[PDB]
Design a protein around this ligand. Structure first.
Ligand SMILES: C[C@](N)(CCCC[B-](O)(O)O)C(=O)O
Ligand SMILES: C[C@](N)(CCCC[B-](O)(O)O)C(=O)O
Ligand SMILES: C[C@](N)(CCCC[B-](O)(O)O)C(=O)O
Ligand SMILES: [Mn+2]
Ligand SMILES: [Mn+2]
Ligand SMILES: [Mn+2]
Ligand SMILES: [Mn+2]
Ligand SMILES: [Mn+2]
Ligand SMILES: [Mn+2]
Lengths: 313, 313, 313
């Protein structure tokens, strides 16, 4: 497929800095070259430079609101530009707050998009429900139209217009959901497959239902926001908020292989890879390796094999 | 839910001593505080003091019969007392021989109970089939009415009256069953899902069928006897008889989440946690952490999230 | 069941030497004694002595063609002899190129055989599609009747006559398939369950369909060629070409338990165990332990338990 890569070396959605090295380590892993080794037409739109906002005091509990809000504003622009050039946006994060900008800019071009959110967390705290104040745990609240009425005017975010409905998103992988987040889930009727449903149904039925849920009525472009902590920390240890009992490497690949097969992948976030948090060099390479793998699957790399349209015999 | 905690620091059902520290390490992990953090009304009935029986020579092959038999006699009493106060008995072991006392005292109050036994082993050796002589591998033989005729009068156990039928118990997790135990399984028509059935059906169908099997005819209180070695040693390494190829952490939580949802959990054993056997400090915390997790799930903690009956928005 | 063990200490199908120690380490693990502990009638046909072919230069890209071709010629003979004595051939490898000889000699006695190939790889490169030149990645091309027309006369292999059709083989476990191999798969209509299908269906349905596929029309003897790298390297690390995201230890046992239950297991290869490649002593024992386990399952050892035809009570 045809891809537009955008690096988002940004960390101010949470406390730990190392996540701004995500684009660097993924690139160094050979992400671009590997995509080209596939059937892929790849344009690198470069790493976004996120200007310092040195004056950025908390809004109530919410931390670094202006830095976070600007970075997403910049990113939305960049994504919209790549979507206009007919390319699948590939955002290398960076913390998950960047999801506000990536989905936003994506929906500017394709308002009918549907979102699949792979994550141990729902990231749906409002600035009023959050207890941490970390904006990487709130991006979904800023995007949901139904929640427009419970989001205060947070400095840095006046540019935002909620662009998805509670029924345009499916979560997969949930296993550490805050109480206010759970309340929002059940109240807005959000579709989710927590680890419990994955256990119950198997990842096969999960993907069946998820795609049926989003694509049933009609075909529409897909946005996959992949938080690497959605996968078990035995595969992606170098990440800020690891939770045990995650999706397996195999489930990870299955999800993305199935998404690729729809032919409707339109936007992709690979988020929260933080090399600094690897207890060892191998934990770092293990995490980065898994991240590349998930990404390659999104763009056609299949476990059964791939071949070019020729006669190999 | 409403819980009555009882510590059973007892080890004489098997050779290794460290298992009598189970209640201590689980308590230190924050078990009680965490239960209270949930919707839980918790009363701690304390650690049972198991008086020394210094004169306790083998009965044939059977080791420490009087100590084991007394500890279970004491425990049955304690459980019956907590069942009378309208509380879910939570026995922190301690080796699995304590199951004789816990189920016994439970059935005194609720004779119509059904048992779910999560374990790598069937624990159904008689004093005549056992080759080890370790009573933690025999508790089920002492409780089955059908086996009353093949249990010799073992000193310490004259107080016991078999209280469950072959058709009131379901095993989940089996993967190291002795030949005599397998003979008993197939002869008495015992319902089991070994690791093979879990592999074949998926833990979803397993729980479906297990609950359907026990609750089909009518609702009745549930006794969950959970041997931590039911789970793979990659999750619960600090245990006396680990067997590879176990239930995953996720399957472990799925079982207990589903049991919680029945609303019929009546008695619970968390057994065979032995800190002394952790090859490292982290193996010890890993085991204890998993044990708490399984327990919290039994009393309502859900992977999809929990919220109080209020409007979080 | 009734077994004829044959050691094949052979490595010239690939670069690393340690794999010729496979028979030694498996024997030292207690394989024969453990089989006898089961219901098993076991005859050891010894370790085949594979004479040096010091003059064995590449055929085009293909390495050690004469050594590989001779070893398989010798092995086919040995297998046919054990099949004539009414025994299940058990070939301890050794690299997977030996599969050419084992299936060949097997089919001499039982031409209607069906093959189950458990592996991360398809091993179906021709001498013209291979890029590595390693013959352990080509054995299936030498055996398929449909490919007879695309196999050059490679020195050492004039004795070979393709003995299976594209529709007599099922792959399970695939996750690193070369492009030419994938082309062959889809062109010849080969039945496979890659890790993707295992993820989608569950190992239960996979085995259901695999056996239905091979045994549907009529009963026929089964050849299981098991490459230990079919399993995840977290279980079988000491092997030449490990690929992450493999079959679990549990799936491994499930496959073989189900195959045993058909009562049609006729030939078995346990291949690619290489002690030299264990990063630690425990990685070596871990691999060998898993290999024995898979083998024991093939010959009746069940996770639910086994008992002799007697009254244990
Ligand atoms: C406690 C937490 N829910 C954690 C959010 C984690 C964010 B991530 O990794 O992007 O999913 C919060 O801060 O609101
Ligand atoms: C060999 C064995 N079957 C082991 C029993 C293990 C007891 B446990 O951990 O409570 O399940 C025996 O001693 O009878
Ligand atoms: C790249 C590879 N496909 C690897 C083959 C591996 C062989 B094994 O372990 O027996 O499956 C090739 O050499 O043709
Ligand atoms: Mn997360
Ligand atoms: Mn996230
Ligand atoms: Mn046990
Ligand atoms: Mn037990
Ligand atoms: Mn292989
Ligand atoms: Mn192979």
């Amino acid at each position: 497929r045809t891809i537009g890569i955008i690096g988002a070396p940004f960390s101010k959605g949470q406390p730990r800095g190392g996540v701004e090295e995500g684009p660097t380590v993924l690139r160094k892993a050979g992400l671009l070259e590997k995509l080209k080794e596939q059937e892929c037409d790849v344009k690198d739109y470069g790493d976004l430079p996120f200007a310092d906002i040195p004056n950025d005091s908390p809004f109530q509990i919410v931390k670094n609101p202006r830095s976070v809000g600007k970075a997403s504003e910049q990113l939305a622009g960049k994504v919209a530009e790549v979507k206009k050039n007919g390319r699948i946006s590939l955002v290398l994060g960076g913390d998950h707050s960047l999801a506000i900008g990536s989905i936003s800019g994506h929906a500017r071009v394709h308002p009918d998009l549907g979102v699949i959110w792979v994550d141990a967390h729902t990231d749906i705290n409002t600035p009023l429900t959050t207890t941490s104040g970390n904006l990487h745990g709130q991006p979904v609240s800023f995007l949901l139209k139904e929640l427009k009425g419970k989001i205060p005017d947070v400095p840095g975010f006046s540019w935002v217009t909620p662009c998805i409905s509670a029924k345009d998103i499916v979560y997969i992988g949930l296993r550490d959901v805050d109480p206010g987040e759970h309340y929002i889930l059940k109240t807005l009727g959000i579709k989710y497959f927590s680890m419990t449903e994955v256990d119950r149904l198997g990842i096969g039925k999960v993907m069946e239902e998820t795609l049926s849920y989003l694509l049933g009525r009609k075909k529409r472009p897909i946005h996959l926001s992949f938080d690497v902590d959605g996968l078990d920390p035995s595969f992606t240890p170098a990440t800020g908020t690891p939770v045990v009992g995650g999706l397996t490497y195999r489930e990870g690949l299955y999800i993305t292989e199935e998404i690729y097969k729809t032919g409707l992948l339109s936007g992709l976030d690979i988020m929260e890879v933080n090399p600094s948090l690897g207890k060892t060099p191998e934990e770092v390479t293990r995490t980065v390796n898994t991240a590349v793998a998930i990404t390659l699957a999104c763009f056609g790399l299949a476990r059964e094999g791939n071949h070019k349209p020729i006669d190999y015999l």
